[PDB]
């Protein structure tokens, strides 16, 4: 699935986003702009031969099973496919496991590299929230 803005803005925040871990709901939505172009089927293979999964690009090396990833874990405890799904609930869920995990939003390096310390409240902007 392809989201609109708008509708992963009000889809991260039915799901608890908004806020998690102090991170206003536009830093979300400026991660998954960057990450995956809001498109939950978005796949990336990291030079590592582990591979980025869904809106939020969560990686096989630590967070989710994907079969093919040496010496990996699975943190968020599910398949990487789950990922994927139109349904943004697993992603979500394991995001929130990320971003507690020391670094913050820094986990995801397009977050540093492109939304940390922008106007991210443009993301949201217009968006009946
Ligand atoms: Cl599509
Ligand atoms: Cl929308
Ligand atoms: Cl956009
Ligand atoms: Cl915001
Ligand atoms: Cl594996
Ligand atoms: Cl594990
Ligand atoms: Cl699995
Ligand atoms: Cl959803
Ligand atoms: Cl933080
Ligand atoms: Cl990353
Ligand atoms: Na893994």
Same mark, same amino acid.
Do not use: E
């Given at each position: 699935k392809v989201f609109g803005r708008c509708e992963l803005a009000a889809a991260m925040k039915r799901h608890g986003?908004? *806020? #998690?871990?102090? #991170? !206003?709901?536009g830093n979300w939505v400026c991660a998954a702009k960057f990450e995956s &172009?809001? &498109? /939950?089927?978005a796949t990336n293979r990291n030079t590592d031969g582990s591979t980025d999964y869904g809106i939020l690009q969560? &990686?096989?090396?630590?967070? @989710?099973?994907?079969?093919? /990833?040496?010496?990996?874990? *699975?943190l968020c405890n599910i398949? @990487?496919?789950?990922?994927?799904? !139109?349904?943004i609930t697993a992603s979500v869920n394991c995001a929130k496991k990320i971003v507690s995990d020391g670094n913050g939003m820094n986990a995801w390096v397009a977050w540093r590299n492109? @939304?940390?310390? /922008?106007?991210?409240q443009a993301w949201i902007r217009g968006c009946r929230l």
């Open positions: 986003l908004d *806020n #998690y871990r102090g #991170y !206003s709901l &172009n809001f &498109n /939950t089927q969560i &990686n096989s090396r630590w967070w @989710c099973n994907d079969g093919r /990833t040496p010496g990996s874990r *699975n398949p @990487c496919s789950a990922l994927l799904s !139109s349904d492109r @939304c940390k310390g /922008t106007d991210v």
